[PDB]
Amino acid sequence: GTALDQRPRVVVGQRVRKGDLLADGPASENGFLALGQNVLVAIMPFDGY
Amino acid sequence: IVVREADCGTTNYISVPLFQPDEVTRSLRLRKRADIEAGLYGRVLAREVEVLGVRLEEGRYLSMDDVHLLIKAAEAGEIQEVPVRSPLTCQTRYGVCQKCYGYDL
Amino acid sequence: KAPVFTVRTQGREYGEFVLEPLERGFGVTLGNPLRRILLSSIPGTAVTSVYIEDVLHEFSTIPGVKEDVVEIILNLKELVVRFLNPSLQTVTLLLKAEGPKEVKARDFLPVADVEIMNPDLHIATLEEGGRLNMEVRVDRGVGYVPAEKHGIKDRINAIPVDAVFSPVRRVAFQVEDTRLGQRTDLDKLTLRIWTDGSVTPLEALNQAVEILREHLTYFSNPQ
Amino acid sequence: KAPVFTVRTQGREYGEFVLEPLERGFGVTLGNPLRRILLSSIPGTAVTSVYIEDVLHEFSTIPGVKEDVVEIILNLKELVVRFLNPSLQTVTLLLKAEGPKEVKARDFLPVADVEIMNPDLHIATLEEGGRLNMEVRVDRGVGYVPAEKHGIKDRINAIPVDAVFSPVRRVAFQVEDTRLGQRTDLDKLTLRIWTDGSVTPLEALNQAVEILREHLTYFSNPQ
Amino acid sequence: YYITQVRKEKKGAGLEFATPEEALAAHERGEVALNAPIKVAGRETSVGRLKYVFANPDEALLAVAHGIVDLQDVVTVRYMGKRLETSPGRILFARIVAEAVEDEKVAWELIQLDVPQEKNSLKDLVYQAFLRLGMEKTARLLDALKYYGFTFSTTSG
Amino acid sequence: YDGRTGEPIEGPIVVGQMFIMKLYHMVEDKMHARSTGPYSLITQQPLG
Amino acid sequence: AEPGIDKLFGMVDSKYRLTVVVAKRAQQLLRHGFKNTVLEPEERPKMQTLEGLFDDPNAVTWAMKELLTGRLVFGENLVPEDRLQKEMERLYP
Amino acid sequence: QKRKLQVGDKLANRHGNKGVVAKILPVEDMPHLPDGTPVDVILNPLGV
Amino acid sequence: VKLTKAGYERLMQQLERERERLQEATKILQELMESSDDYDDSGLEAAKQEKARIEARIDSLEDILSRAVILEEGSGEVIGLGSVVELEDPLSGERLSVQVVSPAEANVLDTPMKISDASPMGKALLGHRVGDVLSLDTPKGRREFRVVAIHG
Amino acid sequence: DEVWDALEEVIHGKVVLLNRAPTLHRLGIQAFQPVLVEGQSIQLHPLVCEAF
RNA sequence: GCGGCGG
DNA sequence: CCGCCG
Ligand SMILES: [Zn+2]
């Protein structure tokens, strides 16, 4: 039950190299696997949250 | 098993030993602080015992301090066992009485 | 020695405000309070709802259009518009271009009283026969609001978007050494503020300053 | 709605203050700043330097006097004096007593416009033939100034004492969540104040708020 | 813990104020120099105690809150009846507890401000509190600890 | 600096870009709250 | 925790007893009408939006607050089983 | 439907630190760096 | 089981040390099971497993210490238990110092290298006296040594 | 918005019980006074985390 | 009923 | 052990 779309990452009229990402997969962007995001994180304690 | 009672009368108590026998051949030692506590904490004295100057009345529930006392005393050499009420000797057929179970609620 | 509140403003985005001298530890005592208001209380604008002609749900796709409805509505919340009078509570920008083109925020049909400081924002890309027409609802609000909280329904088939009202991106205050006075232990608070454009660094500062004062008065009647 | 400013004051030392409801994270925007002020800005009095005739050092012992120099000076920090007008920037308290008597803070000879609200304060016990004569300086300042920071020199053999200006002792504030029909993510600011008696928690608060406001104004003229 | 702990720094020379008065002054100036630290191994008291002497318990905290002393610094503080040689942190701790349960006297009767607070020192605190002031009252101390423990935990860094 | 007090946090704190993800654990699967309803026909149980 | 529960526990020979007493008294508070209390003049329980806890908040809350004072009596066999419910309806509208 | 991250949701890093969202903090008062930039998430050190 | 006063003392002390280690490991174990925060981590299996390796060594020390004989024979002639031997290699004139002891006392860390009773080199030496010469097998070959003497 | 006032009014001093996954000892379920809150998750007191 | 999965 | 999905 998860989204599975392919978002084209190429523009009209572009010279493509053999074996180049035409569109990105469900969790791959730029041809890399991505699952979640990179967030800025501080590593310390809060009240108790 | 439940707790319904009136200080069950039958006084046939369990003696909590303070010294352990063999770990290295024969030689008597003071059981570990923990273990003694386990056996005497929140218990009820079957019979009275003056140990280091204080009179620990019969039936009194010996708090943690009290058990420390008994240990401190055992160090000196005034008592090797302890008279205390327990389920192991309850008269109440089906159930156990206040004095025998002890403190811990 | 009365706080010489100086100002160096460049554009409508950046806006540094110096203010010294200040008795021991007030630079901070002011710096933080104002900062907290600046990001949470300041009012502004955001795209509250949109509607594409042949799209029924936000998770759809429009022919001859690269980006998905979600990739789009995502880009719209990045749209920073600017009204000029309270009489502009809810504006509805309209846009519609076809064929081979790159829709930019500049293609919205002008609305005489409000201006778009976000011109080159990329809205979408169209191949051929790319029929894209849409109406984007915009409002003046405050703070953040989940599209699920307001649920705007201009048209039965339009999709509500998330509210991003804070007209500031980042606030920072610095406390430096003394300039004037007979003692060296003093504060030189200078705070630099960053705005998307809707309002100005100064505008903000002032409003915040006001909101603060506004609350101070609430300590009046006891009970 | 309008912040309900409730009050619960007992005496002139304690003072509970509640103020809700308030918007998201605002109790904290108020509270902290006020605290920062309530301890550093509020003007009051504190003993500055002392001088016992026969005493030369801070660590010694006056015969016939159970208390050590240190204990006495200590006791004096406890002293709470109150001036009436500007003309009193620096007043010298004088006090001499002998024999088998308890030396209370009410034994200092009365000064024209100065008042001692810490009368029964125990300063020193004198044994038979106990000679105790000293001169304690008192000033109006703000916050806390370590004896090593100011270093007053009335008599070249006297001793500088840490200054306990603020008539406020400690300040505690809490940001608990409160309910209001629709939403529950609300702030309820309850701030409690402790004063030595010189002024009441309620006065102090106001003074603070004012002081803050006054500073808000200084953001007026650019340059 | 981090609030009840005490600090020990480096000591160029023999910390002898055990006896010298030119040791109170000198050792105290050598301190104002770059020589003897606010927490030197001085037997009777490290210069840290010499400089700051707090009358009222509040007296200390405010000095902290103004930046004069850090919570974990060894200072001198006049309490109910004794000039005690402890740190603000420690003291603070006392108050916290003494606050949780109104009987301030019974408070310091069951806590040991002689060592940093460890899980155990606390364990035993709770246990004692239960037997001493009643059930609900202890509940209050727990919440109290919970609260402070957490706050300090965040600002400690 | 805190943000709530604007006061620093005594002692450097490490921070950085860490890659983290959301899991197949929405709370969508997490809150059945029952008041009243259906009972089994053969055995008396509030089955749903 | 709860208002002087320790004091309460002290008033009973066994924990569970307190509960039983606490409860049955909360029942009599609603059944025979909610005016069957003993400490309503001063310091009667209270609520926060409108001082209305004087009319009907929690029952048990009351029971306890009443039991905390030496007003009510509790016993193994204090009043004749049935005679109690008869006299109560009589003296309470 | 759209699944926006909320309090009950659980996230985790490639090293094994798993956890649920306890409180969603308003940028307003959360840990920010000297330069205006605030952080996004605070991981309790104690789990390391 | 045969021990020297030296040997006895050593094993007795080691036992003491391992008791302290067990008490520590225990404390630790207890804390873990009490935590119930992070389970399924090498928190239990390690603590436990560690405590085991200890208890085992303890059972070995108590066993040996519970029934060992003490042979007070510092004045003897033939190499027996407790005997301190010294062997010189005829060729290199190398002086080797060793002491044969019961399996439980062996320890290359000691002043005289303490060799097991039922140790090859250990076997070779028992039953011989100053002067004798004997061989055993070695990876490089086989080196004969002459018992130069035997202190207590 | 008035209903909430009501709900929060009906709950005043009532408490509910909470249960952990495997109920092991009597403390596997404790009682607490509920205080209405935002979101889906359930706020639990830290100190009792050890119990369950 | 069988696979998977949370603590 | 308790729980949930397909
Ligand atoms: Zn019995």
UniProtKB/Swiss-Prot annotation, chain A:
Disulfide bond positions: none
Binding partners and assembly: The RNAP catalytic core consists of 2 alpha, 1 beta, 1 beta' and 1 omega subunit. When a sigma factor is associated with the core the holoenzyme is formed, which can initiate transcription.
Family: Belongs to the RNA polymerase beta chain family.
Function: DNA-dependent RNA polymerase catalyzes the transcription of DNA into RNA using the four ribonucleoside triphosphates as substrates.
Protein name from the UniProt record: DNA-directed RNA polymerase subunit beta
Source organism (scientific name): Thermus thermophilus (strain ATCC 27634 / DSM 579 / HB8)
Residues of the full protein shown: 634 to 682 of 1119
Curated annotation (Swiss-Prot), chain E:
Transmembrane segments: none
Coiled-coil segments: none
Role description: DNA-dependent RNA polymerase catalyzes the transcription of DNA into RNA using the four ribonucleoside triphosphates as substrates.
Record note on quaternary structure: The RNAP catalytic core consists of 2 alpha, 1 beta, 1 beta' and 1 omega subunit. When a sigma factor is associated with the core the holoenzyme is formed, which can initiate transcription.
Family statement drawn from the similarity comment of this UniProt entry: Belongs to the RNA polymerase beta' chain family.
Name recorded for this polypeptide: DNA-directed RNA polymerase subunit beta'
Included range, full protein: 790 to 946 of 1524
Curated annotation (Swiss-Prot), chain G:
Superkingdom of this protein's organism: Bacteria
Reactions catalysed, as given in the entry: RNA(n) + a ribonucleoside 5'-triphosphate = RNA(n+1) + diphosphate
This enzyme's EC code(s): 2.7.7.6
Enzyme class, broadest EC rank: transferase
Record key words, sorted: DNA-directed RNA polymerase, Nucleotidyltransferase, Transcription, Transferase
GO biological process, alphabetically ordered: DNA-templated transcription
Listed Gene3D superfamilies: 3.90.940.10
GO cellular component: DNA-directed RNA polymerase complex
The keyword Ribosomal protein is assigned to this record: no
GO molecular function terms listed in the Swiss-Prot or TrEMBL record: DNA binding; DNA-directed RNA polymerase activity
SUPFAM superfamilies found in the cross-reference section: RPB6/omega subunit-like
Iron-sulfur among keywords: no
Subunit: The RNAP catalytic core consists of 2 alpha, 1 beta, 1 beta' and 1 omega subunit. When a sigma factor is associated with the core the holoenzyme is formed, which can initiate transcription.
Role: Promotes RNA polymerase assembly. Latches the N- and C-terminal regions of the beta' subunit thereby facilitating its interaction with the beta and alpha subunits.
Family statement drawn from the similarity comment of this UniProt entry: Belongs to the RNA polymerase subunit omega family.
Protein's name in the database: DNA-directed RNA polymerase subunit omega
From Swiss-Prot, chain I:
Binding positions for Zn(2+) per the UniProt entry: 16, 20
InterPro entries, per the entry: GreA/GreB_C_sf, TF_GreA/GreB_CS, Tscrpt_elong_fac_GreA/B_C, Tscrpt_elong_fac_GreA/B_fam, Tscrpt_elong_fac_GreA/B_N, Tscrpt_elong_fac_GreA/B_N_sf
A GO term, aspect molecular function: DNA binding
Record key words, sorted: Coiled coil, Metal-binding, Transcription, Transcription regulation, Zinc
Domain of life per record: Bacteria
Cystine crosslinks: none
Signal sequence region: none
A single BP term in Gene Ontology: DNA-templated transcription elongation
SUPFAM superfamilies: FKBP-like, GreA transcript cleavage protein, N-terminal domain
Coiled-coil ranges (or none): 1-70
Family: Belongs to the GreA/GreB family.
Record function comment: Inhibits all catalytic activities of RNA polymerase (RNAP) by partially occluding its substrate-binding site and preventing NTP binding.
Oligomer status and interactors: Interacts with RNAP.
Domain notes: Inhibitory activity is regulated via a pH-induced conformational change of the structure. At pH above 7, Gfh1 is in an inactive flipped orientation that prevents binding to RNAP. At lower pH, Gfh1 switches to an active orientation, which enables binding to RNAP and inhibitory activity.
UniProt-recorded name of the protein: Transcription inhibitor protein Gfh1
Organism expressing this protein natively: Thermus thermophilus (strain ATCC 27634 / DSM 579 / HB8)
Lineage of origin: Bacteria, Thermotogati, Deinococcota, Deinococci, Thermales
Chain's gene name: gfh1
